[PDB]
Design a protein around this ligand. Structure first.
Ligand SMILES: Cc1cccc(Sc2ccc3n[nH]c(=O)n3n2)c1
Length: 344
């Protein structure tokens, strides 16, 4: 139901120089716009990116993209599947820059690949303004996995871009799903890869965070708990307490005491980082991503689903609201101690 549009500025490109783009389903009766950033890891040097080009080429090129995609989960237009924003204008922005949405570098003499993720977002926004986004009341920049980190890295830049273009009435907000990671010690012997990636991509981080950590330390701003406090736009954080990608980088794959303590400490640490995040949804589950799967409605924390929490967040942005909470973090300490966790 979402139709592909390749960027009219064909100098804003995927890794291989093909045009980036976006999939759009308009809803003319709505002033809500949802721009979703796809995830899919990243690549950080020539050899690593060459491998990704061989077997993950859709994440590096628009040459083989389909002309349409179906909106699912928070991108669904069916109220039963999407109680939150079923009537919104839906935009899916494919991830084809392999840079966690941070890059601002073109392919050239010196560069085999272009890493333009930050510019792709800006150009999508610019071209959407002429397609109805100029009339928006809310622009929700959402994303999952690398796209969720992408939200944290880009939401304030979108807000600044719209102000500078003359649209101060559009409220820019972020929804970061499964992009809130810890730079913790591994269970058995990632920050090096991002550090290298940033130099390779000419990657950019939000200004206030950059100014805190200073030259050479911008990698810190890829970690939600460090970049989030520096952001001005409202951001809702969705994060499984035992995210499978976090456990993978931690090299966690009958559980003895050392691993039990490691897993319990990870959940405690992640819960701690969310204590001062007033709009958050963090179930005690071992899983990965939430917002674009069709059954995203099923999980609940303290009896409240994510679509409900997001609706309560909308109301809060019109004192806490009676019966309509926005801060929902499990306190139970082990995967699937929440009975509503996904099973299979
Ligand atoms: C070290 C770091 C910090 C923040 C974001 C990233 S990028 C990433 C990390 C995990 C993951 N799982 N699925 C997916 O796309 N990603 N992307 C890397």
């Amino acid at each position: 139901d979402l139709r592909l549009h390749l960027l009219l500025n064909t100098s804003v490109t995927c890794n291989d120089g093909s045009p980036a783009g976006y999939y759009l389903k308009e809803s003319r009766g709505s002033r809500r716009w949802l721009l979703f950033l796809e995830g899919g890891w990243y690549c950080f040097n020539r050899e690593n990116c060459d491998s990704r080009y061989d077997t993950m080429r859709r994440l590096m090129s628009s040459r083989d993209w389909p002309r349409t995609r179906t909106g699912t989960g928070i991108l669904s237009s069916q109220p039963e599947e999407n109680p939150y924003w079923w009537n919104a204008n839906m935009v899916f922005i494919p991830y084809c820059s392999s840079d966690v949405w941070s890059g601002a570098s073109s392919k050239s003499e010196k560069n085999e690949y272009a890493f333009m993720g930050a510019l792709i977002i800006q150009e999508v926004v610019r071209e959407l303004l002429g397609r109805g986004l100029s009339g928006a009341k809310v622009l929700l920049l959402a994303g999952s996995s690398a796209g969720g980190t992408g939200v944290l890295l880009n939401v304030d830049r979108v807000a600044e871009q719209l102000e500078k273009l003359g649209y101060p009435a559009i409220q820019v907000r972020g929804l970061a799903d499964s992009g809130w990671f810890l730079d913790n010690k591994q269970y058995r012997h990632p920050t090096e890869a991002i550090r290298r990636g940033i130099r390779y991509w000419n990657g950019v981080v939000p200004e206030r965070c950059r100014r805190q950590f200073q030259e050479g330390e911008e990698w810190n701003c890829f970690f939600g708990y460090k970049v989030y406090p520096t952001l001005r736009s409202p951001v809702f954080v969705v994060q499984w307490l035992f995210d499978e990608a976090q456990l993978t980088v931690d090299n966690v794959h009958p559980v003895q005491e050392g691993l039990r303590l490691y897993i319990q400490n990870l959940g405690r640490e992640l819960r701690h980082t969310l204590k001062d995040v007033p709009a958050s949804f963090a179930p005690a589950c071992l899983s990965h991503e939430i917002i674009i799967r069709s059954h995203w409605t099923d999980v609940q924390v303290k009896g409240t689903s994510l679509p409900r929490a997001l609706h309560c967040w909308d109301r809060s942005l019109h004192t806490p609201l009676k019966g309509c909470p926005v801060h929902l973090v499990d306190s139970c300490p082990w995967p699937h101690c929440n009975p509503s966790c996904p099973t299979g």
